[PDB]
Amino acid sequence: QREYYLREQMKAIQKELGGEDGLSDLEALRKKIEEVGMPEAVKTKALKELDRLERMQQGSPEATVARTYLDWLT
Amino acid sequence: RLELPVIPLRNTVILPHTTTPVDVGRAKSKRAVEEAMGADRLIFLVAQRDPEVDDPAPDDLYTWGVQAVVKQAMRLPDGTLQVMVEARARAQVTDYIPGPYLRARGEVFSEIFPIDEAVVRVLVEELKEAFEKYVANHKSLRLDRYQLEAVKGTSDPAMLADTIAYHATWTVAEKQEILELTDLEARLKKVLGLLSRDLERFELDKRVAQRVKEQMDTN
Amino acid sequence: MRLPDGTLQVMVEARARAQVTDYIPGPYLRARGEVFSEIFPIDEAVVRVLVEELKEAFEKYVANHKSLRLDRY
Amino acid sequence: IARSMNRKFHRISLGGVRDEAEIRGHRRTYIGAMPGKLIHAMKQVGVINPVILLDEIDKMSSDWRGDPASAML
């Protein structure tokens, strides 16, 4: 029970210092998609690809392909 | 000029301007205390540092020391001596002679005169409400409460600072940095800063504890 | 007040002003003032508003003496 | 030449592979995470100065990726 409490407080202090993300990553990519360009069909294609990317979990080898493709489009 | 020898402490910080017990329990400082009583019976106590050893050395000490007084000394049959002291001031060492026993010639003291006590008074009242609020919120340090009505009328910043830091606990290094400066308002400002550190510390720990209970609730 | 240390400290006070036309490259020195020049304010209402504003600014300056080391009287 | 000017010395001996992945590596997401063969040369030295000999530049690491000409450029 006490080491359960230990991980509870490490999550609380985790958001208190490194849950700071008023700067984020994927929604920063969404804003970057919105502000540059674009033609409208390319913009809808990129937003569908972004939703597909955020639905899956990270570390998978297909998420790296989707991330690199959005990096090249932006 | 009241020659005073170099006598270290055990582990305890003794604050000036404060009637304080002194419990000399080191067997190789009994000689130091006894020949310090051969110097009009006032004792030059040096604060004890980085891990406590029993090695008298001219290079393994420091030269800052409080000046304690012998009223009367209670003896125990194991090398343990009790003396109720009241410190006058902080003193230095310019010329050191090795031993045993190690001797030290001090000079004129770090003396200061109070000018412009009104800014000091504003500093006194903000430090006043500062320690009043910390005693009012946090009781696991188990201090007394009922003495403020007599010492409220005292007008001396060194005695007020030593009174507050005497009954309060933190690490030894900034205790001696409260001791080992020359300015007198600046240390009041820095104990205000350490009080503000205490304030933000209990604010953040109750904040993360609150968040822990909400995470418990969520789980 | 004379002191037996070589330091002769005398308290002085300024009363008026002087002008220098004649000059002696000294020591010693001797000069001569020709005339006296001093102007006084006209329409002292704006001057009185300035005295009140100067007292207000001096009060704001005294109010910031937490790090200036000066008595409050 | 190196000992005349108090630098250090290396050999980097190009041509042994047929790609441009040894010069500029691949990202941490990729499986084979080989860093730069210049950057590992800057690992083998501890100084930012040293002279670097480059053996066999006529035969290069070409013809499966983009050819590492502009990588050398």
DSSP at B147: T
Give the residue among A60, A58, A54 at the shortest CA–CA distance from A27.
Answer: A54
Interface of C with B (CB under 8 A): 65-66, 69-72
- Nearest 5°: phi and psi at B75? -105, 145
Mutate to test the interface with A, among D28, D29, D30 (most CBs of A within 10 A): D29
Query: Does A30 contact D at CB distance below 8 Å?
Result: no
Q: What are phi and psi of A37, to 5 degrees?
A: 65, -135
Q: How was this structure determined?
A: cryo-EM
What does residue B165 show for φ and ψ, rounded to 5 degrees?
A: -75, -15
Q: Is D65 marked as a binding-site residue?
A: no
Q: What is the dihedral of CA B189, B193, B194, B199, to 10 degrees?
A: 140
d(CA B130, CA B146): 17
Q: Do chains C and D touch (3 or more CB pairs under 8 A)?
A: no
Q: Which residues contact B168 (CB under 8 A, 6 or more apart)?
A: B131, B141, B143
User: Does residue D29 belong to the interface with chain A, where contact is any CB pair within 8 Å?
Assistant: yes
Q: Percent helix, strand, coil in chain C (nearest 5)? A: 30, 0, 70
B198: enclosing H helix or E strand: helix B185-218
Q: Which chains touch C (3 or more CB pairs under 8 A)?
A: B
Q: Which residues pair with B80 in a beta bridge?
A: B76
- Owning domain of residue B19: 7-105
The DSSP annotation for D32-65 comes to S----TTTTHHHHSS-S----B----SS-S-SSS
Query: In Å, how far is A25's CA from the nearest CA of chain D?
Result: 16
Q: Is B14 left (phi over 0), alpha (psi -120 to 50) or beta?
A: beta
| CATH code, domain carrying B58 | 2.30.130.40
Residue A20 Cα distances to A12, B43, C6, angstroms? 12, 55, 70
Which chain B residues are closer than 8 Å to C65 by Cβ? 119
User: How far is residue C38's CA from residue B111's CA, in Å, rounded to a whole number?
Assistant: 50
**How does DSSP classify residue B29?**
G
* Pairwise CA distance, residues B180 & B165, whole Å: 14
**Whole-angstrom Cα Rg for chain C:** 21
Rounded CA separation B176/B16 (Å): 12
Report which secondary-structure segment, H or E, holds B121: helix B117-137
Residues of B with CB under 8 A from a CB of C: 115-116, 118-119, 122
Q: Which partners does chain A have (≥3 C-beta pairs < 8 Å)?
A: B, D
Q: Is the alpha carbon torsion for B147, B153, B154, B155 positive or negative?
A: positive
